[PDB]
């Protein structure tokens, strides 16, 4: 019954072409996090990358100035009932 | 055939307990799931008492020795669940709890086996 | 919780019976490290390893089969108590070199079979 | 189908009051051997003592010279089917 979704996803520092996002680890054994980002207006490819389960911050680079981006983070975690599985994502919007 | 029923009746109660205890408790401490640990410590205890008690009752029906050890304690304990937890910690870069989970399980199960053995050993003396 | 209970019982019984059959046939062949108990742990590590990578790619499987294979079969197949008395018996017999070697082979071997099963299926997919 | 009884029990050395026995260990994890010895002639009390499973010899002291003794040895071994149990004995006769 423990949630495997991260909490408090947020941009903690920003430049016009890069973002420093952070989140709170869920109460499960997170093998690694997956960070997705793309332009909110669904006319741009979505990119994904992983960070180790020990890190709870990530940097997104190569962005465009003054553009709305949808940033999501989900976990690839271990639990007893489900072994490895992907969690539902926590998502935020942010405008560079 | 009768020996087969001992493993099935004993193993089912052991696996049922392990399932109930793991789903109810494993999530409370994911760095070292306490449900997988208790069933192993509890199985080491049962196997330790059985080790000492059965030695002094050489005329016990092997049916009961088989149901408690191979069946109950066998199905109660788990080595695979102990492994994925350690494997997942190693995959999560959580090396300090992968090692800690290996020591606590191994050292603990042996200690629980010695306690079960020596408690019955002392009671008879 | 009743249909989930049948998954643990059926898988565990098949797993407990396999551990019983394999142990009485092969453990006596090499007592310093009974190969029957080692095989059922390596095999359960392999099963839980393949399930780790296969369940990850099949997120819509009935929790009934996931329960019957992991908590049932692999759980009932592997044992931590039988691996404890063998180590406890070697320690009481002063056979420390095999008591230590048994602890390493089981723990590391079970994680390798978990990794092998996880990476064979990760590479096939 | 592996025997827990020792084999080839023999007196390898002897003094008028002592006997050094030796045996071949059975291919099972022996925790300790139980060595019993008593005067073969009728009703003398049989005496026993243990020897660690790592040893395959044992000394018997305090005997009477020129007396027939029956010496039996069995194991307290671990097997998968019986956990801790006692094996059948192996016995020899000897005269000091
Ligand atoms: C006692 C021996 C038992 C048998 C052997 C068991 C081996 C288990 C771990 C193997 O799996 C790998 O572990 C790496 C280490 O955890 C992970 O690195 C991941 O996490 C690291 C964290 O520092 C990052 O640096 C890597 O880039 C990233 O791939 C990697 O993904 C994962 O596949
Ligand atoms: C790191 C985790 C630890 C977890 C707990 C481990 C518990 C170990 C219990 C060991 O049991 C003792 O072992 C001694 C050594 O085998 C035996 O000595 C017996 O055997 C010795 C070795 O042959 C002889 O020297 C002794 O005289 C003889 O009493 C002794 O009887 C026995 O009760
Ligand atoms: C983490 C804890 C680690 C340490 C655990 C305890 C190890 C030391 C035990 C000391 O007490 C032992 O008790 C044995 C009985 O339980 C005695 O065995 C005597 O009797 C046994 C049979 O009961 C025989 O098998 C033995 O060979 C014979 O020495 C033995 O002499 C005595 O020293
Ligand atoms: Br057992
Ligand atoms: Br499992
Ligand atoms: F395993
Ligand atoms: F155990
Ligand atoms: Na089990």
Author numbering:
A (entry chain D), D (entry chain C): 1 to 96
B (entry chain A): 2 to 126
C (entry chain B): 1 to 125
From the paper:
Microbes are protected from the cytoplasmic accumulation of environmental fluoride ion (F-) by export of the toxic anion via fluoride channels known as Flucs. These small, homodimeric ion channels are remarkable proteins in two regards: first, their unusual ‘dual-topology’ architecture, in which the two subunits of the homodimer are arranged antiparallel with respect to each other, yielding a double-barreled pair of pores related by twofold symmetry; second, the Flucs stand out among anion channels for their extreme substrate selectivity. In contrast to most characterized families of anion channels, which tend to be non-selective among anions and sometimes poorly discriminate against cations, the Flucs are arguably the most selective ion channels known, with >10,000-fold selectivity against the biologically abundant chloride. The protein possesses two deep, aqueous vestibules with an electropositive character due to an absolutely conserved arginine sidechain and a deeply buried sodium ion at the center of the protein.
In order to probe the role of the anion-coordinating sidechains in more detail, we mutated Fluc-Ec2’s bromide-coordinating Ser81 to alanine, threonine, or cysteine, and also constructed a S81A/T82A double mutant. The S81C and S81T phenotypes were more extreme: for both mutants, fluoride efflux from liposomes was completely abolished. In contrast, the structure of S81C provides a possible explanation for the lack of fluoride transport observed in the liposome flux assays. An anomalous density is present in the vestibule, but has moved ~2 Å farther up into the aqueous vestibule, relative to the Br- position in the WT protein. The pKa prediction software PropKa reinforces this possibility, calculating an approximate pKa value of 6 for S81C in the crystal structure of this mutant. To test this idea explicitly, we monitored currents mediated by Ec2 S81C in planar lipid bilayers as a function of changing pH. Whereas fluoride currents were near zero at pH 7.4, currents increased dramatically when the pH was decreased to 5.5. The increase in F- currents was fully reversible with pH, and WT activity was not altered by changing pH over this range. Moreover, conversion of a serine from this anion-binding site to a cysteine introduces a strong pH-dependence to the fluoride channel activity, demonstrating that this position comprises part of the permeation pathway.
